[PDB]
Amino acid sequence: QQPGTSTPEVHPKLTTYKCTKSGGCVAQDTSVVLDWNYRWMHDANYNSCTVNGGVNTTLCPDEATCGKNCFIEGVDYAASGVTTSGSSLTMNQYMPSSSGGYSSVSPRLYLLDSDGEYVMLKLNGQELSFDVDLSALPCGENGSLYLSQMDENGGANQYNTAGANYGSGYCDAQCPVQTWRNGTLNTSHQGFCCNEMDILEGNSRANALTPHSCTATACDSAGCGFNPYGSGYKSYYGPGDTVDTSKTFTIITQFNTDNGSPSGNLVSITRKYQQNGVDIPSAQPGGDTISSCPSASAYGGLATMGKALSSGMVLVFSIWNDNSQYMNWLDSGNAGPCSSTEGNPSNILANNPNTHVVFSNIRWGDIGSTT
Amino acid sequence: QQPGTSTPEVHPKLTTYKCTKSGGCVAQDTSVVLDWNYRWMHDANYNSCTVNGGVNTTLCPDEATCGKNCFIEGVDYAASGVTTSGSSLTMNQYMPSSSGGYSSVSPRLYLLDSDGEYVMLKLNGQELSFDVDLSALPCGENGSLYLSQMDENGGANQYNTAGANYGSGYCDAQCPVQTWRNGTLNTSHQGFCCNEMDILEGNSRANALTPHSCTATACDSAGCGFNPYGSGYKSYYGPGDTVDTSKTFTIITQFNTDNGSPSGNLVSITRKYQQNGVDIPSAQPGGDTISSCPSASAYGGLATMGKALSSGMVLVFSIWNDNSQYMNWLDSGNAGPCSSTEGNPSNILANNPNTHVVFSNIRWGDIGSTT
Amino acid sequence: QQPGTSTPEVHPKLTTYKCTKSGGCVAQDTSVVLDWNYRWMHDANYNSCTVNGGVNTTLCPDEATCGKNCFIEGVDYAASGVTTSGSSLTMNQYMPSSSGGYSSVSPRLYLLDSDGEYVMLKLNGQELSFDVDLSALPCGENGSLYLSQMDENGGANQYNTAGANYGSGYCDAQCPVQTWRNGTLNTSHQGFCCNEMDILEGNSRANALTPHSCTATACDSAGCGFNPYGSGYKSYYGPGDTVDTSKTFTIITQFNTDNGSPSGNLVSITRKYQQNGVDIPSAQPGGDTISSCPSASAYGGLATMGKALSSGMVLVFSIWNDNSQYMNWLDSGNAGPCSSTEGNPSNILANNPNTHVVFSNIRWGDIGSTT
Amino acid sequence: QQPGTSTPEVHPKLTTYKCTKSGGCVAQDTSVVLDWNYRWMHDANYNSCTVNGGVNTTLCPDEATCGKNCFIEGVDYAASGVTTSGSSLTMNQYMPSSSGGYSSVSPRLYLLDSDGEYVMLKLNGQELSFDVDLSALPCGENGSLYLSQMDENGGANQYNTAGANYGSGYCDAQCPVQTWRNGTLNTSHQGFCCNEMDILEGNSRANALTPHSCTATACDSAGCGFNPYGSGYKSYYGPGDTVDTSKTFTIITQFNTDNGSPSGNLVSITRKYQQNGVDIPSAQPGGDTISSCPSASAYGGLATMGKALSSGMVLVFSIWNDNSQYMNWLDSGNAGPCSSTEGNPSNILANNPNTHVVFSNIRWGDIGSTT
Ligand SMILES: *[C@@H]1O[C@H](CO)[C@@H](O)[C@H](O)[C@H]1NC(C)=O
Ligand SMILES: *[C@@H]1O[C@H](CO)[C@@H](O)[C@H](O)[C@H]1NC(C)=O
Ligand SMILES: *[C@@H]1O[C@H](CO)[C@@H](O)[C@H](O)[C@H]1NC(C)=O
Ligand SMILES: *[C@@H]1O[C@H](CO)[C@@H](O)[C@H](O)[C@H]1NC(C)=O
Ligand SMILES: *[C@@H]1O[C@H](CO)[C@@H](O)[C@H](O)[C@H]1NC(C)=O
Numbered sequence A, B, C, D: 001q002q003p004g005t006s007t008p009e010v011h012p013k014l015t016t017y018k019c020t021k022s023g024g025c026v027a028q029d030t031s032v033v034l035d036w037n038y039r040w041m042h043d044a045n046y047n048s049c050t051v052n053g054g055v056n057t058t059l060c061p062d063e064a065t066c067g068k069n070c071f072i073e074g075v076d077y078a079a080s081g082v083t084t085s086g087s088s089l090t091m092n093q094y095m096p097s098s099s100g101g102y103s104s105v106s107p108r109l110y111l112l113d114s115d116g117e118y119v120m121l122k123l124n125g126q127e128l129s130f131d132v133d134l135s136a137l138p139c140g141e142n143g144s145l146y147l148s149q150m151d152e153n154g155g156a157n158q159y160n161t162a163g164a165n166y167g168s169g170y171c172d173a174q175c176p177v178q179t180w181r182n183g184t185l186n187t188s189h190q191g192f193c194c195n196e197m198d199i200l201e202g203n204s205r206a207n208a209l210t211p212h213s214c215t216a217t218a219c220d221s222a223g224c225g226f227n228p229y230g231s232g233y234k235s236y237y238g239p240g241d242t243v244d245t246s247k248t249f250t251i252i253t254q255f256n257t258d259n260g261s262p263s264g265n266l267v268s269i270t271r272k273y274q275q276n277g278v279d280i281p282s283a284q285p286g287g288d289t290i291s292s293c294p295s296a297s298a299y300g301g302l303a304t305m306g307k308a309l310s311s312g313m314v315l316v317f318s319i320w321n322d323n324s325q326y327m328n329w330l331d332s333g334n335a336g337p338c339s340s341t342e343g344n345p346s347n348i349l350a351n352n353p354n355t356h357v358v359f360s361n362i363r364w365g366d367i368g369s370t371t
């Protein structure tokens, strides 16, 4: 697959920053990209190269062929519930349709850099900070801001000229088997494991910080995550609570090393919220931090994550609903006020089709410098 | 892929029955098969045709090639934690190893018939009954007995001569994308949706009856299931409770039609347990039945399921643990006494590597005839 | 003695079958019972009615008295090394104890029928078939499956209301003098002779088919049995041999009449093994059969046995070790590879306390129909 | 039961001796008695008190009754194949009959003393010596000379006035349940365990020295016996061999203590044969002795036996054939030249109905003094 011509890819500009303890914060000429899978792809004669997410065997038998055969076109971000305003990103879960009422558009964005390659965030011994407006996201919705260890140029090769410009080469701790594994038509039917740091993953009812360490072969699927509600702080993060989701708040995640510097060794992942200028106090005394990561032991607990954060990671924006378990693992039962049923997407579409996440002012750098 | 020669496939015999209201129950010359994926596969020179679950591109580029190239060998069921004794099946979650301690063998069996093709259970307007010993399965384990609408001969074609004799062609409501989709090397990378009736799915702490209706294109992932605990009957099914998992009990599922006969139209799925000869009373008054199936609406709620049960379905034995969500959806939170952590497989392996399910006396037929 | 109340008698269910050449095999609602002697018996005040296997003279002076005085309680089959799974019976020779290590529990079971009376097998001119796993039984152990001509209701009278529900009225060719002879306190001190057909009697090292004919007064103690090893076939039945005890095999015994039908006259007892689906060839050419029965002459050789098999016989499951002659008569010397000492129970307990027999899929009926 | 009147009991005189190292051997006015069970017993009106070895319930309901009701008569020793000539006892296995040919008379004698009570042999730290003529006893016959720890007056009580004069109160390591247990009608149906020293037990083909230690409750059924043939000396004891059974030989058994005197502690049982005046050499180097008695451990190995030999034991003469196992345990297989079949009593009766044992010159006393 190579760049198409019917619809040009014009990346929605999003301004991010890199703060240094001394030289403040610098504006970055970044932007967002829609994940490869959401695009239109076809041969010169316009027959589709895809078939229900899979490929057209005739046009896509091996790799060298689609490479020379198919073209993946750009998208209409607006129509995809993706919009930007300076240093602000707004993602919708649904969009009105010509046909019926609302169709579930579920964007998955990547922070692209000016050179046409994913911004390589190196957060080891540093901090990433942003503003969120989860007010819209109700029970069942999943707003998401996480780092994945993807190839900076979306694994673009001789047969994939699209690359990061078209969101090629996704991956996460779940080790997904994909039609296009790392920029190549996965002809070996293998999964794709890569480190995944899940900074924000939640809605207006609850949230969760979850680190996933990895081997070349596998990952820590169930992460050693932190959820105030799950940890018995049922009245900290929520509508009108300590953090108060009803309004905008700031999420500050610091990756602490043993030598206290980016030079090496991850030791803890410190979370600190702050709303209305004033710093919000921790849920658990001493600080909301992820020190020991039991689950990750079998994959080089923490050690590997930090090495991954050093090598550099891609930023991933996403909002989605669970048609299978209604995201109960995130906001229901013992980890959220939501009821087992309340998260049903159909019910979300019914009572709040206007749900959207609004990420704003994304800036990473030295600890304390991003503020 | 075709039948191998290094290890012959000798199916573990399991005696099932077909009861008629008048002529009692008849012994069936059935047996169990291990799912295609657990087997060894290679070319004539012994290079493997698989690569981490995927395929060897060189030996497996298209379909006609593996067909003529690879051979899938049989397995050592005992070594796979699968054993049978007359009308009794015993499945282990782990097995001791030459190398380390225990390796997680997770069998997935299919009821094979004497002719070398899956037993086509036609449960519409009838009943399937069996005995279970969930005593071993603790928090996190998932004992499983469900019907899937698979091709009776595992989609065996000109390139797949193995077929049902080697557990070819699996599928379920989850619509899994597989390396071998319906007996053919999935060269189009498409999922495989098929109706899935989940009769038993649980451990010694909780359980769940869940029907999944389907379209040719999709299925009802989140089923309109029933879980006594979830439905607010926290002291009905459990160790020392009304049903009492600590001992063996009987699970009787009846598929009721409107004309009261196999002739047509599914209307409700009635569940009735009985232990120690005496019939156990319902959890909810009037009978533990699945009448309305809300979720399934978008796929021909109930209607489709019954038509599927009429066409005939394959029986699937399985026991597995969740490395990602610790099966919390089944036995934790609001649907089980188990704690969020308690289901971790590593913790299962630690405190009870001997977990096993023992399905016994499987007999299906007219209502009341199987007893 | 009458039914007790402290421990209720709940029979372990075991599924057997009755096959007809035309109508296949039908499931039977049978079960197993523990022999009268293994039970607890006491008066209303809880003083025991037994004294080292004998009786308490004061509570048990005649018959009318114990009848009205003593109650025999039920047992904990599990604790007695007796367990069933559908159509499968597993009997242990020892069980761990609260006190010391292992205590020698030696079950003796009877196939009980739904009506509360022993299943009356009528094997004349027919066949009984089953599956055995002698792998556990080493030198010295005696796995056993034999028919005894006992009273269908364990000789239950006005003073014995327990009957077959409590394994009353045992007997065999050995003509044992018992404390309870045919349901009555043997106040005349007489033995109890009854026909005894010994189908399986052996371990993993050797075995023996032995018919015992009887008069009202006596029996053919030394039977005209058949033992491949004894008959000079030292490499037919054993670990890794033709029959191969290390794995499960099938034992098929056919009682051939002169008119070829159940109508009458026993002529020969044909034995035929089959393992792994394939039929195993005979040890001696022409067929492993018991034609002439020299010993039985003085008791109506064969003739009487057949008449006995016609009247109906009770099935007896049993596993035991010989503290006196180490079962040498069965597996040592000229009738087995075992050494004179090797069968010592103490030595069995030491090197293999886990010995157990697993009888499975018991079905009797027309010749060839049980398969 | 009390002494009868129809047939008076006249004991066949047998001269034994007591040798002292200094004062030579003294003649004893001993005699032999036939075991209680071989006698005729009836009430005053002549109805029998026995029924096939058991008792007549009406005449024998309790103990006080038979005591006052039944009379056990004496016997015709000659007719019982029992004859004595000075210091010589001759016992036949069969006797010609008025009716058919030969009836199997199988005497069991006890050495009675002048006072009307069993001779209490105290063999601890001493020696018993005798002459045997096993020439007649062929394969299958069992000549026997053993000590049993019976009550000197056959347990004679208020209801049994017969006592030792009529061979009352037998017992052995086999712990036999008897109609008359220790002189009383066994109304409790209990066995009778007592120490049993088996000095000679064999025929013209092989033999066996076997000690049985006992608890009050049980005994060492399988004794820690010695059989030259079994111990791999197939050409020592037999027709024309080292010992040469074809002619008369002497059996000398010495019970060695640690203090070397009757004062205490059994340590070993030394066997030494001598024929034709010359002393026969041992089978195994160092001496044919029973040092360690493994089996007897659970019953106070050796220790108990010696204490028993000190308390005093009754002498038992006996010759019998095995209708069940043809005495194979004694002279066939790995413990004798005899074939499995060769020991059949019917075959004995056929080819040698004249078998008889001839015990002669029985003398016990200090070691070496009996010669
Ligand atoms: C697949 O490709 C062939 C040939 O280009 C075309 O005829 C067919 O319509 C395509 N399938 C789809 C779903 O576009
Ligand atoms: C993805 O493909 C690019 C192509 O060069 C490669 O550099 C990168 O290492 C690949 N990633 C993995 C995990 O194979
Ligand atoms: C794949 O096949 C090629 C050629 O048969 C072979 O060289 C290679 O080792 C195979 N790969 C694996 C993992 O077996
Ligand atoms: C699976 O393949 C067989 C091959 O003939 C076919 O009959 C069956 O319909 C296929 N199933 C699906 C869902 O395509
Ligand atoms: C026998 O019965 C009597 C009276 O019931 C009682 O005192 C005695 O303890 C019993 N004996 C045993 C061993 O239970």
Ligand SMILES: *[C@@H]1O[C@H](CO)[C@@H](O)[C@H](O)[C@H]1NC(C)=O
Pocket (backbone or CB within 6 Å): C151, C155, C156, C157, C182, C183
């Ligand atoms: C056992 O007792 C029952 C009681 O009626 C009787 O029918 C049966 O014949 C008896 N058996 C013998 C051998 O006496």
Ligand SMILES: *[C@@H]1O[C@H](CO)[C@@H](O)[C@H](O)[C@H]1NC(C)=O
Pocket (backbone or CB within 6 Å): D047, D048, D049, D050, D051, D056, D057, D058, D059
């Ligand atoms: C038992 O005793 C009764 C009464 O004395 C008598 O009628 C009966 O014949 C006796 N039985 C035998 C076998 O002698």
Ligand SMILES: *[C@@H]1O[C@H](CO)[C@@H](O)[C@H](O)[C@H]1NC(C)=O
Pocket (backbone or CB within 6 Å): D151, D155, D156, D157, D182, D183
């Ligand atoms: C046998 O009975 C007599 C009667 O007094 C007694 O002295 C002796 O101890 C009894 N033996 C046993 C073992 O009870």
